[PDB]
């Protein structure tokens, strides 16, 4: 049921180091399950939840990958490649 | 190659 | 004051891989302290809070142990042995 | 033998 | 913009093992960013969020340091040195 | 020498 979860927003295509990057996840059509957000790149992220919202901050510029996985399977289009600009 | 992750349960 | 915390619910006796398992924790009689929920078994869990609720998902079938610890002491009946069925 | 844990503070 | 974040409260100067220690963080003047709270000492802490609140519990007595960092920079006065008394 | 950390995003 990972194909039923979708995500979108500016934080899945660009960010800026030190500036929260945001996107939403659409949950209405999805079943129940575990939802994991990971960021992988040249530095560590803080990632918060808040359909749901996700905000994340990385501290260094570089190319990052954001995955959204539902019961350990990539949703459509995950992983997202996000270039992160210098602050 | 750093990984950070956060997790929630969808009902 | 760990003996004053109690927990119960279907998620302390069975689960299904990929399906959120749920139980409640009764906090009314308890003091203030740190409350930890751990799941230990053949795969990793996502565990959320939501008296309080706990929902967790594991991805593989097998025997798991769920502990609920208050200031690092098992509450009554913790650890809970939970067989997890295939999805 | 995997362990996962989450934590909160009870007031 | 870490110098614009301030924190205060009894949990930044003393605690007691097993008893939640609390302080607040003043966010009104601050920009957007990642906010990290760490506790470093002779045992592990549970730390929760709840301006915002922070409550943390450590299980052993000893000297701890609590840092509040905004985009990986110590806010004013961080790290806080907190002696933790026996329960 | 134990470290514990929790994290949030400030908007």
Curated annotation (Swiss-Prot), chains A, C, E:
Phosphorylation extent changes in response to cell activation. Polyubiquitination in the CH1 domain by a SCF-like complex containing ASB2 leads to proteasomal degradation. Prior dissociation from actin may be required to expose the target lysines. Ubiquitinated in endothelial cells by RNF213 downstream of the non-canonical Wnt signaling pathway, leading to its degradation by the proteasome. Filamin repeats lie at residues 1-84. Ubiquitous. The modification Phosphoserine is found at residues 48, 86. It is found in: Cytoplasm, Cell cortex; Cytoplasm, Cytoskeleton; Perikaryon; Cell projection, Growth cone. Promotes orthogonal branching of actin filaments and links actin filaments to membrane glycoproteins. Anchors various transmembrane proteins to the actin cytoskeleton and serves as a scaffold for a wide range of cytoplasmic signaling proteins. Interaction with FLNB may allow neuroblast migration from the ventricular zone into the cortical plate. Tethers cell surface-localized furin, modulates its rate of internalization and directs its intracellular trafficking. Involved in ciliogenesis. Homodimer. Interacts with PDLIM2. Interacts with RFLNA and RFLNB. Interacts with FCGR1A, FLNB, FURIN, HSPB7, INPPL1, KCND2, MYOT, MYOZ1, ARHGAP24, PSEN1, PSEN2 and ECSCR. Also interacts with various other binding partners in addition to filamentous actin. Interacts (via N-terminus) with MIS18BP1 (via N-terminus). Interacts (via N-terminus) with TAF1B. Interacts with TMEM67 (via C-terminus) and MKS1. Interacts (via actin-binding domain) with MICALL2 (via CH domain). Interacts (via filamin repeat 5) with SYK; docks SYK to the plasma membrane. Belongs to the filamin family. It is linked to Periventricular nodular heterotopia 1: A developmental disorder characterized by the presence of periventricular nodules of cerebral gray matter, resulting from a failure of neurons to migrate normally from the lateral ventricular proliferative zone, where they are formed, to the cerebral cortex. PVNH1 is an X-linked dominant form. Heterozygous females have normal intelligence but suffer from seizures and various manifestations outside the central nervous system, especially related to the vascular system. Hemizygous affected males die in the prenatal or perinatal period. This is Filamin-A. It comes from Homo sapiens (Human). The chain holds residues 2237 to 2328 of 2647 of the full protein.
From Swiss-Prot, chains B, D, F:
Phosphorylation on Thr-6 (but not on Ser-4) allows interaction with 14-3-3 proteins. The modification Phosphothreonine is found at residues 6-8. Leukocytes. Expressed in neutrophils (at protein level). The modification Phosphoserine is found at residue 4. It is found in: Cell membrane; Membrane raft. Belongs to the integrin beta chain family. Integrin ITGAL/ITGB2 is a receptor for ICAM1, ICAM2, ICAM3 and ICAM4. Integrin ITGAL/ITGB2 is also a receptor for the secreted form of ubiquitin-like protein ISG15; the interaction is mediated by ITGAL. Integrins ITGAM/ITGB2 and ITGAX/ITGB2 are receptors for the iC3b fragment of the third complement component and for fibrinogen. Integrin ITGAX/ITGB2 recognizes the sequence G-P-R in fibrinogen alpha-chain. Integrin ITGAM/ITGB2 recognizes P1 and P2 peptides of fibrinogen gamma chain. Integrin ITGAM/ITGB2 is also a receptor for factor X. Integrin ITGAD/ITGB2 is a receptor for ICAM3 and VCAM1. The VWFA domain (or beta I domain) contains three cation-binding sites: the ligand-associated metal ion-binding site (LIMBS or SyMBS), the metal ion-dependent adhesion site (MIDAS), and the adjacent MIDAS site (ADMIDAS). This domain is also part of the ligand-binding site. Heterodimer of an alpha and a beta subunit. The ITGB2 beta subunit associates with the ITGAL, ITGAM, ITGAX or ITGAD alpha subunits. Found in a complex with CD177 and ITGAM/CD11b. Interacts with FGR. Interacts with COPS5 and RANBP9. Interacts with FLNA (via filamin repeats 4, 9, 12, 17, 19, 21, and 23). Interacts with THBD. It is linked to Leukocyte adhesion deficiency 1: LAD1 patients have recurrent bacterial infections and their leukocytes are deficient in a wide range of adhesion-dependent functions. This is Integrin beta-2. It comes from Homo sapiens.
């Amino acid at each position: 049921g990972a194909h039923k979860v979708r995500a979108g927003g500016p934080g899945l295509e660009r960010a800026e180091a030190g500036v929260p990057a945001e996107f939403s996840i659409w949950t209405r059509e999805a079943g129940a399950g575990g939802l994991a957000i990971a960021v992988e790149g040249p530095s560590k992220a803080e990632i918060s939840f808040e359909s749901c919202g996700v905000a994340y901050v990385v501290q260094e510029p570089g190319d990052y990958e954001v995955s959204v996985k539902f019961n350990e399977e990539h949703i459509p289009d995950s992983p997202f490649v996000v270039p992160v600009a210098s602050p | 190659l750093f990984k950070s992750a956060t997790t929630t349960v969808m009902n």
